[model samples]
Target: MSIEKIWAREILDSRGNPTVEVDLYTAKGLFRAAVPSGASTGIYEALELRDGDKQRYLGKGVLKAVDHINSTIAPALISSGLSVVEQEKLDNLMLELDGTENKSKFGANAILGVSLAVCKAGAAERELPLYRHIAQLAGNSDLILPVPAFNVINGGSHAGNKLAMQEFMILPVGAESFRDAMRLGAEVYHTLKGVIKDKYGKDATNVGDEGGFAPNILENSEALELVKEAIDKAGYTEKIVIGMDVAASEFYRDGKYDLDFKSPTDPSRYITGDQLGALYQDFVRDYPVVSIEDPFDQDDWAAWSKFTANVGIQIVGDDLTVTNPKRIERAVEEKACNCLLLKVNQIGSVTEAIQACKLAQENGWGVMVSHRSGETEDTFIADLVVGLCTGQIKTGAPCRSERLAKYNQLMRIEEELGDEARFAGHNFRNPSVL
Candidate 1:
């Protein structure tokens, strides 16, 4: 394997309405390296090499903190003595993601996007089957650990929020390829949990990968219309378990702050228990949605009950659980949610992620493995899902690479399994599309 080039880039996605950007990455040499970026919300955008790690994106880290990694760590890493091989190693390790997780983060799911394109053009040297490379790099170390996760049904105002769509989280354990997902996920959850909670009432005990709530209600009514349109345009059927993303933050529902296209500047302002439950009820009636995310502010148990009792579909909460045991324990005890979204990045390692999954299974709640909008094409999560055979994943709409990466990877995994793949039980979209 020779060396070619390594670089990064950012761009807007097709869902570009008001203007959100996606990041891209690539590494050229021996085996061309690349990654797809996802929605960072200005978080994980720039990589810093400050850690002496060969690959670094000069971007922000944790709660819009500038100069944390984007400025310091990333540059430091570039200056560090990284052997070509080491850089190549990291490059390959990061590049072969090619799955839904990548797109889920607002990045493209494949190298065709910015990051991979830049890396490929610069390195333009070689390439291989993305999965092939992953198998080689990962091998059978039994490093993947399965985490415990469950789904929360953030009941909407009406029963429109169905009882179907599979939603939940799982931690991939002992897969031998996901250590960072665990560590970083935890670090972010711990760091931000305090600061954000200070501003927003600490409703739930857990705070997932990057706190999740109702539809980016901040996006505006038109945005919602767009979502509706996307569903209609797709010509979807009842067979498809489609739903909406309730990304509302603290101040999301406040009358003064809550505007669809124009959300409040501060996310900590709106999340309320009443509002959360009402929102869930709202979806249940008007929308064909099967689930609601972060519907009732995590702290509101009664609200959780209101939402859960009222609906049969999955209600998810990333912030509610923060992908941790004690936090998820609280939700389960209260019977808060019906599904969970397990994220590895929030904790920065796989160990904790798997624990999160294990806990979810024990409870009988459904789970959905997610890809951070601020993500990479790393399909590492694919293995975890395949191993657990848990169904349902939110890779985003079917079109983009960021979303498709995971979908494609899962399908391939199923193909490889040849009857071993329990995709029908793992996800709704996989079987539909395949």
Candidate 2:
């Protein structure tokens, strides 16, 4: 069987705000392919192996790995004239007659908005739940959470980081069903996030890290009261457990991420060992925090080991893992941490992701599939997670419904799977979720 067309999209995301969206187009088939895009941020979404001293590791001399699917890959694949497509298409008719075949000829490209339209189309046409379709294919979906929308605060303030960082969590109101959960969560997120972004400032990701939005736990007592009240009303946060994201590092303080500039003399500010350690300390105080990600620099194994020993939570390696199996192997050897955050692009392909998960599992370490901050809502990771989990799946605390689409997909799949599936999670939470 011959192949036809394929398409893809990229996100122009900056802490949840979009300045502009550059639509991508691709026409791919068989073998090698090519991808071209006009998005300004598209360049950042890709990594190149170039002659430059800065981003060479991204690819083979500047032709880097890309976060978004490229128009180039389709052409590249067509050039090879292979039939990998025939093997994976869900059904023969879907393989031979689906518009994706011809659409692939146009170049596999789109922006975040365009990508989402397909989700709506998919929901209507299939008469299946949106996330469920994602679940049928991938397994797990993303979780979008709502919290009192607020600005980030400066200094070592606690309030700012907490709220502004609500990328995947929602304010759980009394909801007995997932649909109710979705309704309440979205209402709160959109309303509060809009106020904070429109009236206060932009940069959801930065606000938390920079403290530019200043979140106050005590001063914002009403929000906390709502949270407690909501949790209690929603059956005291039962069905699900809570996890905290501790990206604490020396560079993060006063809401600033203190990234190191290329030049040594560039006003030297970056995250330090103690700063990361302190972040973990701050987290263990109140949150149930089963998983704490990036408590230290990836290179700082000493800090990783130290923090893992001390914290009541599990430290998930992201910058540390980057989808590299060897990294987890080393961590396992040192007993560095018990969990690994698996990102496909970080490793480059689905096959590699599987290998990475297997390695982590073999080492008695846990695997958590994740979505990137610069995301496309592909829902690919969601399916992969549900297929493998003993029930425990993690993406983020929740922010956008698009991201939440992945979570919705997962719940649906769990319901559909019936008996054969089980979650291989970090703790005893949901029953096998089969």
Candidate 3:
């Protein structure tokens, strides 16, 4: 069975933003996949299609993207056979059809949507599960389950809160299994909700894009303390550890960082690049923050190296790497960061996303597959992280169907794998350093 036809539509994401959802028709059956959007996007990330009409969905509509998939991409891939081995070639074909360096012509949104649908169609053509097919294509058959990095507290661009850190997450690296870790996360998440609500009022329990609570707290450290208290209160202090996404790019202004973007009267809030690194050092020493993402601005390579050299915790690159292999190569060559926050749409295709992960793995760097803030019900990333054997994942908190959808899919995958599945657990951590 080969792909007979292809089409796409503009659908609403978690934030009610328009996004592209693609469907592939083949002799075997119909296969579908959707590419997610991000609110706190990297400057170098692949371009997503938008209508720019201003009238519909705040000009964030993807009707043009849908048309490109229906017209340009579908016709090109009409006769492609249903074989998982051909994913790279097909993705490359779409890339070539776009004819742009960053997939701007057709937009990464359209390309990723069609690209994923083709893979799903191929997998459906065979009787294999999506993860198994992906792993098989990656030339690995091992069922390596990933540890979840649940984003229990959201801020930065994901929320209207004052906290500058984008995400305050809990990593249950000490859990015995994937199911066990998920259970621990849910418990702590609910406990954290209660703690935040009690201290910051009821509206503090309201969620941000990734389902994490968006308390209107002023100090960033206050959120961390709340999560720590939640962990202790949930009786999982030993099992759960904290991590964060500083998203410092949002704070960087001119030659220095503006610590308080919300405060207009706080002229004394600015800090130099080195001072920012110092702040991260202090936070790590004080808190159980095992992973700190983008502690400095993404373009500030000197600051990245300085912080990576000093911090014992994982230094992950999101805006810096953007899931691009060339960027990953440069980062590894410079020793700028030790881990990557892999977002598949950042590269515009699944094959390239896997290549990024493989490159990171070859360099002995940790891989934390992540979901964008503006997401859909598509659970491809869950299978993707498992297939790449990344061992670490950062879906949103265990709330909202879109966020919970990923965890629910992982639970199903673990159940389906039976005894063969291996939870990532503490394997993602650097035991000697921590």
Candidate 4:
């Protein structure tokens, strides 16, 4: 059935900041979902509406969004016949209701909340599991499980630290199944905690927004060294590959990159774009680094192309692409990277995100399903990654309930699949084999 009613309310995200949570009602049932925010957001990312009211929530309040939903969005949705409604139509209706180019009126945060809530309602009405409903909408008859990319160390915007790199992730590239992958990554994550506590003191084990260890170690390579040690200590070795989200945009300033990282070649001052590229090359050569995301500034297309050209591993576009189909195509034209990090909130709706994934996969590029730094208890993305069958995921450090919720869903999905389940493994990139 079509959505009969819609509602939204202001809620707290993982960072204890205000966010939007939406509820959808249909003839058969009701569904609810929440949206996540990010600290290190891209300029091109969809606008998350917030009240500038100085008196409430320090101008971060989403009450205006909540009002817009209760008044504008709810009325329109209630008037529509949702029994025949599809996801794209439902999303397009809301997009048109806002009548803004960037969805600044209703706010992507507002639109996405209702959009996902309706999606959940539609799934429930069909009496299918959430992931299976998404797969049906995706036109996939068979399910493909996704590999987990666990973020073990944090810095940059996600943490209160001096380190430049944003995230250091562990990929279970060799695991045969999603369960095995989670098990392997959890071992490394816990081991990394011990490693951090022993080497940098107990304070270093404090978890970041994405559940990674936020240590005082300022050196980029030194952070990777600890992750390497964690991997070896966990007995995974090369089987568990390393990846990083440089989030270089956070460090790019004054027409150049600035950071505390000492150049191995120069050892004197901060490195620029090409120098940063060389450092990543050094990283991939020295460590089993399989993925490097946003290795350069989002706007630094030249540097992105340069790194993608030289790097043998995955050069994923996060801030660069922002999960926009236009930018994904642009990256493809420029040969910027072979992969894109897909964040549902970046585009505002499931329909748009599905389109982005479609374009990326059709172009022979990889899509790594991801979560925002300011997450929620809602684990819808766990279902999305499996529904899209991207073969890669980066939720967090597997510590907090928000992070564990997604992992637990994946485990349950793997169990439900039973004999027919197939893990994506590292073969998703190798279309020659997949």
Of candidates 3 and 1, the better by lDDT: 3
**TM, every model:** 0.49, 0.55, 0.96, 0.95
Candidate 2, 1-434: lDDT as tens digits: 22244443222332432211222222321122122221111111212112233443322221222322245443443344444322122222222321342123222222222232222233334455443443433434432221111111222212334332222233232344434444554444344444445443665323332112232322222233333334444444543333433343323434334433212323345446666467547545644335556655556678788878876556677767766776777888887787776665454334345567767766767666666543434454565564444234444333444456565766565556555333332232222331
- Please give the distance, in angstroms, between residue 394's alpha carbon in candidate 4 and its true position after superposition: 0.7
Per-residue lDDT over 159-248 for candidate 1, one digit per residue giving the tens place of the 0 to 100 score: 122211112221222112222223322332243334334443455323222222122112223223333443333333222233544543
Worst 10-residue lDDT window, candidate 2: 37-46
Comparing 1 and 2 by TM-score, which wins?
Answer: 2
Cα-based lDDT for every prediction:
0.39, 0.41, 0.85, 0.85
Instruction: Evaluate residue 156 in candidate 3 and report its C-alpha lDDT on the 0 to 100 scale.
Output: 86
Clash totals, every prediction = 162, 85, 0, 2
* Reference-based lDDT, residue 264, model 4: 31
Which residues of candidate 1, in runs, are more than 4 Å off? 1-235, 253-272, 425-434
Q: Please write out the lDDT profile of model 4 over residues 1-434, one tens digit for every residue.
A: 36667778888988899999987877777788999888889999989898998898888999988998999988887777654237888888998998887789989999999888877887877788888888877776677788788888988855767787999999888887889999998899999989999988998889888888899888889999999999999999957889899999987765567665322322345567988888888999999998999888889999999888887899899989988988899999999999989998898889989899888888888889899999999989989888877888888887888888899998999999899888888775532245
* C-alpha RMSD for every candidate: 14.7, 10.3, 2.0, 2.6
lDDT of 3 by residue, 281-400 (tens): 777887788998988887999999877887778999999999999999999999899999999899999889888987987887988999998889999988887777788898889998
Hey, what RMSD does candidate 3 come out at?
2.0
